[PDB]
Assembly symmetry: C2
């Protein structure tokens, strides 16, 4: 059992010695020599893809940018003319779009059938071509019909090939992984052991790149181990698990939701903060679940709305404990922001919590009234109750970001990226746990469980389409690192609920990579 | 040189080995064997006094109570009849009163001259008799004229004996120590090395008692070292010393003011809390000293009055940092109190801080107006601005004391023990700083106000402030004895020890602080 004594028992000095940074730097230098060697464009893209799936982008941004800019410019910006065969087109399109380039789905028109209704059946002979097309299709943005055709075409083919039997077991395992969730829907850090193992098993793998990915795993793992030790001690010191007997003692789970949200080589403060915010979201939701009168929940909601010390006296003891704990944490977080960023954020932090509990209170109002929401009402609530806006809107102030009033009000709209993050998080949970979204659809429409399931799968893809468009909006008030965190909240839900999870969590956090 | 890296560099593991607790337990048992042996009453009392001055009362409460009750009962409760010679009367009176017995100053009447105006001059031959009478005299309560006579009589004799030369060098040093501050005005923990070294040199010292004193010193020092490490890391993590250009980095000094306040074998939470509150008192005082308009200080005072998050937006940046730091700490403290004591205290903690800043703001209002307060005005404000009430009223809620509304409102009067603590703290600072000024011709405010009020000399004002200090102690002694006091005895001890700490610092330092906290006793 992952109690605090267990968590604190691990050493975090295994990789502190200066030889490890020196070895890592040497490996990085050697990989840059390779990235700078003349080679065919497709091989450059395959190298970038292998490094990026090992979580190594952080070390090679300049090299990636130079390689990709060259391929972009060699093919006139990927706007019309054919750029290569199906594999090269799919891989280059995917990597260019992921690195911020403006590319058109029209580059896929060369691979369609005569009427343009579908891709050419003959292109489906080659499994790896079809797989790359599949991966690219999930970068679809609003209005991009060709990438939806690509998704349907390539999914059907890959499912058929698994069905017929794929003798290459390593490729089979990779395809089953992408069929469960495409790479765009997964987080490299959460799966860092799987990606390292997959890479090592390839006959064409580069041992220097494997060695770099391994030592980076080792150092990242130990950095995150120290973080979860600090969050665990923080939690133990609050004594909340003892004072609130109805909350579950799950601090590792809360940290697991945080640890894949940010670029893993920095953002230590933000991972710990997200874990603590997620802890408070959970226990406040537990408070709304455990009380048995709407009037008591109204008192708690009103306390959060007033956000003052006087409200403590209006609450029963368990609610006093919960309220004062989150009130104290918000003041601590505001103090850190005031000291390090210079900015008075506490009014905004209060608004982040108020949105959350107004969402919980609305759910309770439905429950105590005996009202079942329509699916539209369910989702409108759930994107503010599920807590992505509450997390991301607070993390915003801990990073160098504009604090000008109108830009902050744009974040606190909430900006639709924050709602789309919550939407993906909610829908993935409802789909995996199979009243939730599917049941509301069935209720609304007198429809079958299969019909509701298919509709909610469509809603998840549509939310991703909208998120992809939102991430590309040049006027977005969120920087790329916070957009990545918002999307990663949805992806974490997809990993937990859409593919035991306790063993994967412990495997990533506490078990060595040999 | 006392930075956080230095402070954290010390190990705190040595005296946790189970052999040290096992040895300590064995020594305690051996001392209990001694306490239970047949011996004359005066020797039992001298043994209690030795153990008490080594800070060991904690281990021998049952035995002390048995011994003292017997002596109380033998002498009809110390109410009228003569109990002994002058030395026994003085020693028994002092220890009985210190341990909560109701004893009368009338037991000293047998030692007075014919008119009863003074003590008998012949009794002044014996230095140790006169010394013991002197120590007893500082237990004086309101109205007790005989103990005031005792003070004047014995002080004059002891001073003369020092003048004429005392050949016993160890006794000379003990007498000089008590003439500077009598034992009632000193804290055993602050002076634990001095008392241990004095006991080691006694020809009649008992090696078991010394060893227990030494091992207790080692364990306490290590416990307090771990506390100052925790407060130092807390302080470092706030970054207040870097963020506020006008604050001094003085966390060890803040911890020194806390470390003698409580019974030293427990109260770790309360020592650390007191050090943090003193830290915030100092920082908030810095704020009132550095900003240069009354309107800016009004903004801060108003923010504390409202005690809300909206007020942060009214303040310039360094006031935002200070206000939010103390607002956050109050929230943290309130959470600990809620969790461990069950009580919602935040409204009372806010009142504790508001009293402090209204005191500072009152000083500023006088300053900007060019008004010099009378002495009574100065002291009425200063006894709150100096912060004893702000400390003690908050510590109240961390102990298992009634939170019933009328008890708490009694504490938040403030109860007069809290004001008398601030009064002693402030008078001792003004007196010692004036007597040892950094700049010649400077006078601290209590003496200056007396000079202004009365068209009096600096010397007359100094003598009056000495009188006010003795009178504050007389009132404090009476208040400590009031059976209806809403403060537990451990908090009354801390309130009195805030005064005593000021007396130790200003009335007779960084070497003494480091020697207590960081240097081994061998």
């Amino acid at each position: 059992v992952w109690n605090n004594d267990f968590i604190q028992s691990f050493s975090t000095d295994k990789y502190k010695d200066e030889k490890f940074l020196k070895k890592k730097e040497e490996l990085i230098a050697q990989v840059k020599v390779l990235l700078n060697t003349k080679m065919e464009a497709v091989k450059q893209l395959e190298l970038i893809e292998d490094l990026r799936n090992l979580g190594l982008t952080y070390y090679f941004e300049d090299e990636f940018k130079k390689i990709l800019t060259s391929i972009y410019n060699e093919h006139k910006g990927f706007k019309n003319e054919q750029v290569g065969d199906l594999y090269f087109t799919s891989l280059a399109f995917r990597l260019l779009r992921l690195h911020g380039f403006d590319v058109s789905e029209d580059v896929f028109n060369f691979f369609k059938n005569e009427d343009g209704s579908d891709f050419k059946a003959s292109l489906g002979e080659n499994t790896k071509d079809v797989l790359e097309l599949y991966e690219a299709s999930f970068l679809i943005r609003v209005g991009e019909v060709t990438l939806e055709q690509a998704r349907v075409f390539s999914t059907k083919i890959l499912e058929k090939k698994v069905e017929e039997g794929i003798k290459d077991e390593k490729l089979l395992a990779w395809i089953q992984h992408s069929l469960a969730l495409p790479l765009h829907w997964r987080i490299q850090r959460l799966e860092a052991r799987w990606f390292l193992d997959a890479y090592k098993a390839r006959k064409d793998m580069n041992p220097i790149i494997y060695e770099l990915g391994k030592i980076d795993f080792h150092i990242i793992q130990e950095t995150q181990l120290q973080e979860v030790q600090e969050v665990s001690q923080w939690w133990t010191n609050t004594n909340l698990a003892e004072k609130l007997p109805f909350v579950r003692d799950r601090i590792v789970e809360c940290y697991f939701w945080a640890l894949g949200l940010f670029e893993p080589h920095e953002y230590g403060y933000q991972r710990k903060m997200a874990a603590i915010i997620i802890t408070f979201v959970t226990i406040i939701d537990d408070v709304y679940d455990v009380y048995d009168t709407l009037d008591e929940l109204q008192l708690f909601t009103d306390a959060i709305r007033k956000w003052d010390v006087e409200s403590i006296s209006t609450l029963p003891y368990y609610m006093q404990v919960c309220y004062l704990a989150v009130f104290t944490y918000a003041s601590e977080l505001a103090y850190d922001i005031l000291k390090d960023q210079g900015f008075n954020s506490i009014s905004y932090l209060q608004r982040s919590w108020l949105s959350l509990v107004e969402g919980f209170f609305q759910e309770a109002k439905w429950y105590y009234a005996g009202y079942t929401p329509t699916l539209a009402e369910y989702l409108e609530n759930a994107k503010v109750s599920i807590s992505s806006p509450t997390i991301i809107s607070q993390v915003y102030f801990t990073l160098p970001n504009s604090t000008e009033r109108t830009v902050v009000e744009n974040v606190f709209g909430y900006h639709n990226i924050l709602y789309l993050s919550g939407m993906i998080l909610r829908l993935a949970d409802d789909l995996g746990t199979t009243q939730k979204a599917i049941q509301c659809y069935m209720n609304d429409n007198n429809a079958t469980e299969e019909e509701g399931t298919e509709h909610v799968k469509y809603l998840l893809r549509e939310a991703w389409q909208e998120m992809n468009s939102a991430m590309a909006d040049p006027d977005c008030p969120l920087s790329e690192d916070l957009v990545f965190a918002a999307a990663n909240l949805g992806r974490t839900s997809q990993f937990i609920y859409l593919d035991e999870i306790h063993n994967q969590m412990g495997g990533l956090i506490f078990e060595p990579y040999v």
